[PDB]
Amino acid sequence: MYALTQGRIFTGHEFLDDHAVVIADGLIKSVCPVAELPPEIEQRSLNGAILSPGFIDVQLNGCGGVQFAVSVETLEIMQKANEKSGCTNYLPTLITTSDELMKQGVRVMREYLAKHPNQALGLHLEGPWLNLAALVDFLCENADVITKVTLAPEMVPAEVISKLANAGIVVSAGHSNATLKEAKAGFRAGITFATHLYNAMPYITGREPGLAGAILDEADIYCGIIADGLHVDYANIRNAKRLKGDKLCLVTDATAGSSLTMIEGVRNLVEHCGIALDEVLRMATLYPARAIGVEKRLGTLAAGKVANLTAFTPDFKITKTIVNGNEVVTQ
Amino acid sequence: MYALTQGRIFTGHEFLDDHAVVIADGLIKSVCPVAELPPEIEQRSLNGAILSPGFIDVQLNGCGGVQFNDTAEAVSVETLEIMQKANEKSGCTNYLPTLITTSDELMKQGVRVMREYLAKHPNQALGLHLEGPWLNLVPNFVRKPDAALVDFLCENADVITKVTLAPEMVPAEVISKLANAGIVVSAGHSNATLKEAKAGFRAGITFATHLYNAMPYITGREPGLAGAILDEADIYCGIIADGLHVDYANIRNAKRLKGDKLCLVTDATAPAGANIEQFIFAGKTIYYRNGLCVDENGTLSGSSLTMIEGVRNLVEHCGIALDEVLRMATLYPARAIGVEKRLGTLAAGKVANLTAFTPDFKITKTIVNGNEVVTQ
């Protein structure tokens, strides 16, 4: 048991000043004022660094020189890499149509989940239904380890989208050339998330808003966006933020095609999109968490929540990362 | 002196219930409760109809079977007064005739005609809206021809309300001169990038012509002009609510991003308040078949939208409160062309230009300068 003190701590709702976060048994015992801290506890200093729950990256193809090979070692190498940049949780993406590769993926993730709690959260299946009956049932059978699947709403029957959504899987629209009507139909069918907004989607025109236009117009649809100043012009990010409010998540379509890390993403959103650091942090934690249904366990810094945290300096350099109450990065 | 009573009256800021609007000498004397009404005044009933300031249409090519374009016989004061009478039948009491042309000669006649009209008809057709020449249908250095034009335009800023130009095709100095002469410089019919667009805003542009139309597509890498307009908080812009030129979803997205800077416009052409089957416009031959202005090819070629139709469409298809819609057809446009302290609302001193319509959106009456000009 110990407490983190001497630094601004962001809980997910506000910034606390002279408080502390006491960690115990991999969980957050409580976040209280430094005064209320019992005298018998170890105190670990933050040195002024901002302390927040670890970032949750829900769209990751690979990092630290590896891509998902589809084994648990890859999964743990990616984890160690993400930590060096404040990311404590992520979703490995599996691009494939090989029903065989999918089974191995599902199997591998399941094996990993048993060994490593609160880290790689689950699979993100991209394909087959893209645009660039046995399957559906298979996917639902393994909804316990398949967190989300990306498909093109034009290329898929609505019944397929419903089944996936009822199995508790997050169905995402992406790599599509869908019209607004086509897009809206997929939302009614159960889709509740869109993969990296503005990318792999049609252009927005006045006559046809397209999928992006639909995502922007649908208030109840979460969606990720790549803040690297390369895949999406910052002006579009600002426009999206205003239209999507609390439904916009920061993602790094990171690979070995961006090379963006989450703090880099946080920095870019704060110094180029004029979004308050407070909101940006929610876009890298609370919102993604909320989007994949793990919020009552990972979105914030609160009693009972898993102790996955990250701390960085005002100039955006990771000073420390904590996974399950254990310091794993010290800078 | 008389007062309008018995109907919801929208002032521009809120809806009043048991109040009245007293008109006198073409002006609005005051908007007070029916009780506070002196006993010696004539009372005109609205019959439950909503009463609001007349609509201001800042992008109009023609209506009632006439256009203020092409043939030099059309660009006259009679056309200007026919368009006015037409607009009234649909609640529009003020507008800006658009003149598409590069004929320095046609421009002079236009400027001259507007000036003649302005002397005869106060608070109606407000001024010219020059579209072209600096467009991009097919460099911050100013050429010689640019200069003669610019200087001419500034000389006549008194009757030239706004000009539409493509920010890529024009030196910044030209945009500043126009803006300093008091003219509203608008971005439109452009293929400008966001950077190009932003440069024109810093140069003085403060308005964009019919958003999403005659502009590039918005992509992730390049937001384009539309993306810039949406991102710039201090830029007013018009938008065509006919469910044809812009999908209603884009309108909703724009409304949310532009807040009080979005104006309802009808890129209306001759068919508007008429029974025309086909007509010429911009050299192209356009057909009005199925309330849809198209060309030989079948491409959208203008609109036949009237302002109440626009108001109706925004209320029943964009989920925008009637209150806001009305601001988009009055207060905002007014604010955009700088006539707000005279026409945007129903308040003491403001010109008495009003329109009244039933809940099902039918104009029951239009008042210009305190005079009933439409009764239904």
Three-state secondary structure readout of chain B: CEEEEEEEEECCCCEECCEEEEEECCEEEEEEECCCCCCCCEEEEEEEEEEEECEEEEEECEECCEECCCCCCCCCHHHHHHHHHHHHCCCEEEEEEEEECCCHHHHHHHHHHHHHHHHHCCCCECCEEEECCCCCCCCCCCCHHHHHHHHHHHHCCCCEEEEEECHHHCCHHHHHHHHHCCCEEEECCCCCCHHHHHHHHHCCCCEECCCCCCCCCECCCCCHHHHHHHHCCCCEEEEECCCCCCCHHHHHHHHHHHHHHEEEECCECCCCCCCCCEEEECCEEEEECCCCEEECCCCECCECCCHHHHHHHHHHHCCCCHHHHHHHCCHHHHHHCCCHHHHCCCCCCCECCEEEECCCCCEEEEEECCEEEEEC
Q: Are residues A282 and A173 in the same domain?
A: yes
Q: What is the CATH number of the domain that holds B180?
A: 3.20.20.140
Given the residues B57, B247, B267, B295, the one annotated as active site: B267
Q: Are residues B221 and B178 in the same domain?
A: yes
Closest-CA distance, A200 to chain B, in angstroms, reads 10
Q: Are residues B301 and B366 in the same domain?
A: no
Q: Are residues A19 and A60 in the same domain?
A: no
A7 three-state secondary structure: strand
Q: Are residues B300 and B202 in the same domain?
A: yes
Residues of chain B neighbouring A238 (CB-CB closer than 8 A): 231
Which of A208, A231, A236 is closest, CB to CB, to B223? A236
User: How many CA atoms, within 13 angstroms, populate the side-chain half-sphere of residue A164?
Assistant: 33
A156 CB burial (10 A radius; 0-12, 13-18, 19+): buried
A223 three-state secondary structure: strand
> Treating both helix axes as pointing N-terminal to C-terminal, what angle do B194-202 and B172-180 enclose, rounded to 10 degrees?
40
**Domain count of the fold of chain A:** 2
Q: Are residues A72 and A207 in the same domain?
A: yes
Q: How far apart are CA B168 and CA B134, in angstroms?
A: 9
Beta pairing partners, A57: A90
Across the interface, whether the CB atoms of A207 and B257 are under 8 A apart is answered no
Range of the domain at A6: 1-54+295-331
Interface check for A129 against chain B (CB to CB < 8 A): the answer is no
Q: Are residues A265 and A328 in the same domain?
A: no
Resolution of the structure, angstroms: 2.6
Method: X-ray
Q: Are residues B324 and B351 in the same domain?
A: no
What are the residues whose beta carbons fall under 8 Å from the beta carbon of A214, sequence distance 6 or more? A178, A180, A183, A184, A187, B249
Q: B64-93 burial string, b = 16+ CB within 10 Å, else e?
A: bbbbbbbeeebbbbebbbbbbbbbbbbbbb
Q: How far apart are CA B281 and CA A178, in angstroms?
A: 35
Nearest CA among A237, A212, A230, A219 for reference residue B230: A237
Chain A interface mutation, best of B253, B265, B299, B300, highest count of A Cβ atoms under 10 Å: B253
Which of A206, A217, A235 is closest, CB to CB, to B223? A235
Across the interface, whether the CB atoms of B231 and A213 are under 8 A apart is answered no
Q: Are residues B234 and B287 in the same domain?
A: yes
Neighbours of A326 (CB within 10 A): 11
Q: Are residues B144 and B37 in the same domain?
A: no
Which chain A residue has its CA at the smallest distance from B244's CA? A207
Q: Are residues A27 and A133 in the same domain?
A: no
Interface check for B294 against chain A (CB to CB < 8 A): the answer is no
Q: Which of residues 160-219 of B touch A (CB under 8 A)?
A: 194, 211-213, 215, 217-219
B64 is in an annotated binding site: no
What are the residues whose beta carbons fall under 8 Å from the beta carbon of B13, sequence distance 6 or more? B345
> Treating both helix axes as pointing N-terminal to C-terminal, what angle do B172-180 and B144-155 enclose, rounded to 10 degrees?
10
Which of B194, B215, B252 is closest, CB to CB, to A217? B252
Interface check for B233 against chain A (CB to CB < 8 A): the answer is no
Across the interface, whether the CB atoms of B227 and A242 are under 8 A apart is answered no
Residue A253 known to be catalytic: yes
Interface check for A257 against chain B (CB to CB < 8 A): the answer is no
Across the interface, whether the CB atoms of B246 and A199 are under 8 A apart is answered no
Closest-CA distance, A207 to chain B, in angstroms, reads 5
The tokens for A211 are 């999928």
Q: Are residues B229 and B288 in the same domain?
A: yes
Across the interface, whether the CB atoms of B227 and A214 are under 8 A apart is answered no
Q: What is the CATH number of the domain that holds A22?
A: 2.30.40.10
Across the interface, whether the CB atoms of B250 and A198 are under 8 A apart is answered no
Q: Tell whether the torsion through CA atoms of B24, B30, B35 and B38 is positive or negative.
A: negative
Neighbours of B246 (CB within 10 A): 21
Across the interface, whether the CB atoms of B247 and A206 are under 8 A apart is answered yes
Closest-CA distance, A271 to chain B, in angstroms, reads 16
Q: How far apart are CA B316 and CA B308, in angstroms?
A: 12
Which chain A residue has its CA at the smallest distance from B223's CA? A236
Across the interface, whether the CB atoms of A243 and B231 are under 8 A apart is answered no
Q: How far apart are CA B366 and CA B372, in angstroms?
A: 6
